[PDB]
């Protein structure tokens, strides 16, 4: 089976995806290892199958998400729900916002 989610891109990140904020995608509920799908897999999936800009520097840097991007899981900062390890569940929204603030 596959699992359905919605990913949103804001703060300029949308421009990397045909200037489109919202996307609906169906992930494999399990990774190559066969373990439940996690945000880390998602991030890796977006960079390789959804970005239309070839500069992957701008979203993921050395297999992890670029600094200065907020990640909200159902409107909750992913620091409160596990980072890059939250096991993705159906109809889960993941919001990526790039901000120059917080420096």
């Amino acid at each position: 089976e596959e699992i359905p989610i919605t990913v949103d891109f804001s703060g300029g990140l949308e421009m990397l995806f045909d200037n489109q904020r919202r996307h609906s995608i169906s992930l494999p509920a399990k990774d190559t290892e066969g373990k439940p799908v996690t945000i880390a897999f998602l991030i890796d999936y977006i960079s390789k199958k959804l970005m239309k800009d070839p500069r992957t520097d701008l979203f993921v840097l050395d297999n992890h998400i670029r600094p200065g991007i907020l990640v909200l899981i159902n409107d909750a900062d992913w620091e409160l729900e596990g980072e890059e390890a939250y096991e993705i569940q159906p109809n889960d929204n993941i919001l990526f916002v790039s901000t120059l603030h917080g420096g």
């Binding site: 120059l100 603030h101 917080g102 420096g103």
Partner: protein
């Protein structure tokens, strides 16, 4: 007034003057010196310079990020060839002198001057409502090599120390 962007490859504008209190070596904020004029146009006409503008002295981002970064890496700026570091703001020369002291600067490593009525900053388009913008201008023997402004509040990406160091290493 008149406005013209200050861009790399330009001659640094003439008649640019700031008001400042020369460092005497004291860190006492209750004893204030005597402001005098600083002829930026003449000082920048020889050697590498780093002119950094900040919106407001004693404010959070202006303090806890921007100036602290330059102070933390003066050795690295010196090793890179920088002959002088200027920090300007609309604050008067007395407040600027107290701000520099509050940061332990007792010598000329970093000078703290006042762009009175944002006269210079307004002439290059980086001021508003009586405060200067957050920008940084690297100069070398009179000619501008880098002039970038940080528009988003809190950002020191373009005018911060690390931006200036990167620009200096590319020559």
């Amino acid at each position: 007034g008149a406005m013209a962007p200050l861009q790399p490859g330009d001659s640094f504008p003439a008649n640019v003057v700031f008001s400042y209190i020369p460092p005497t070596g004291s860190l006492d904020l209750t004893v204030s010196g005597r402001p005098i004029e600083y002829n930026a146009s003449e000082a920048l006409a020889k050697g590498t310079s780093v002119l950094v503008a900040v919106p407001g002295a004693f404010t959070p981002t202006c303090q806890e990020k921007h100036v602290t970064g330059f102070i933390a890496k003066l050795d690295q700026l010196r090793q890179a060839g920088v002959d002088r570091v200027l920090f300007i703001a609309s604050n008067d020369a007395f407040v600027m002198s107290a701000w520099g002291k509050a940061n332990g600067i007792k010598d000329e490593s970093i000078l703290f001057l006042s762009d009175s009525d944002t006269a210079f900053s307004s002439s290059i388009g980086w001021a508003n409502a009586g405060r200067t913008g957050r920008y940084a201008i690297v100069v070398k023997d009179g000619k501008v090599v880098y002039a970038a402004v940080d528009t988003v509040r809190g950002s020191t990406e373009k005018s911060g120390v690390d931006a200036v160091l990167t620009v200096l290493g590319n020559q």
